[PDB]
Design a protein around this ligand. Sequence first.
Ligand code: HEM
Length: 154
Amino acid sequence: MVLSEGEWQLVLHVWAKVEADVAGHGQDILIRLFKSHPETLEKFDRFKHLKTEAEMKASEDLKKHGVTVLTALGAILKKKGHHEAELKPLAQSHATKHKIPIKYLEFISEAIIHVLHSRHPGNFGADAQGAMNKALELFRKDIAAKYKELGYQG
Ligand code: HEM
């Protein structure tokens, strides 16, 4: 699939706002993921013990990881589709080391959309959300294709 320049502009415009507070956005997104789909928390040996949202909010380690994740996602989005290089190491670790099914990538996509919608209503109207969804679908399709090449496609 291919996004138009106009769609990339809507994506990068809302992402510029997210970048004003990467740590806060990372926290909100991961917590949303873990609360909505608790099964995903089981994949993290380091966070598996967190029992409540309060505990999740207080975790310095979870917050640091959220920053790592958003920074990696941000680099991919800024490539505007030309992310083959950035996708390789990411797909390898998530397929082979962490073993993350595509289904879980859909869950985090939903968490990202939910948080942008709550925090940036003025910059995340219907068109902007459509563009973000298309960007994340492209991301998932390309990761799924790499998963298959690596022997996982899980
Ligand atoms: C937009 C989606 C995603 C991005 C950009 C992303 C990015 C990253 C990055 C950059 C790291 C660091 C180095 C590495 O291991 O490759 C990481 C680690 C990891 N990721 Fe993701 N990830 C995503 C989604 C997921 C999902 C949905 C799951 C699980 C439900 C997952 C589970 C993990 C685990 C288990 C680790 C290692 C945590 C640790 O160091 O203890 N990832 N991810």
